[PDB]
Structure 1
């Protein structure tokens, strides 16, 4: 799903620690974890960034969160977690393929960066 490292992962061209997959999204552990549990849920549709998401993508985006909340429970995150979407330079988006970060396993702090 795209010309980024995330597309190669969806195409199983390179390995990743896959947590969940369905016909429209993929959840896998972040290769550079920022908490004891740090995973990503990404759509298979290549949406480069949240800023260009069409209105029609609405339920799909909601799907990423539902899948994220479910994956978090099965990863033992019963005390809480933080969901994050980064947009552009100021947002610190590392890959231009929409991705929802889910982090937990430790006390997350405020401000969120």
Structure 2
């Protein structure tokens, strides 16, 4: 089954794209929780981190390196926070794996 992030990948609805490569896409979150807030997602449809397999390991890694590179290109030099949410306790909204990256203000602890 398909999601909104699928449509973003297929270019079927607009998003402000920060970065794209053959295996992932980064773009601005539509409901930002920080002055800068974006997502990195994989093009491959993994519905959630709990069902990712051991050979997805390079791809998940790639999402984080892309995250921190986009963070640096977006001027986030005081810091940032990355998050991945799983399932209803973790507050996962879209069932296509994704990495949040937030910064531009002081983040607080605990993180939800």
TM-score (norm 1): 0.98
Per-residue deviation, 1:108: 0.3
Following superposition, which runs of at least 4 residues in structure 1 exceed 4 angstroms of deviation?
Answer: none
Per-residue deviation, 1:14: 0.4
2:31 is aligned with 1:32: yes
How big is each residue's C-alpha offset from its partner over 1:55-106, in whole Å with a ceiling of 9 and x where there is no partner? 0000100000000000000000000000000000000001000000000000
SS for the counterpart of 2:96 is coil
SS for the counterpart of 1:65 is helix
SS for the counterpart of 1:86 is strand
Give 1:84's aligned residue.
83
Residues in 2 aligned to 1:44 and 1:92: alpha-carbon distance in whole angstroms: 22
Mark the runs of 5 or more structure 2 residues left unpaired by the alignment: none
SS for the counterpart of 1:95 is coil
2:67 is aligned with 1:68: yes
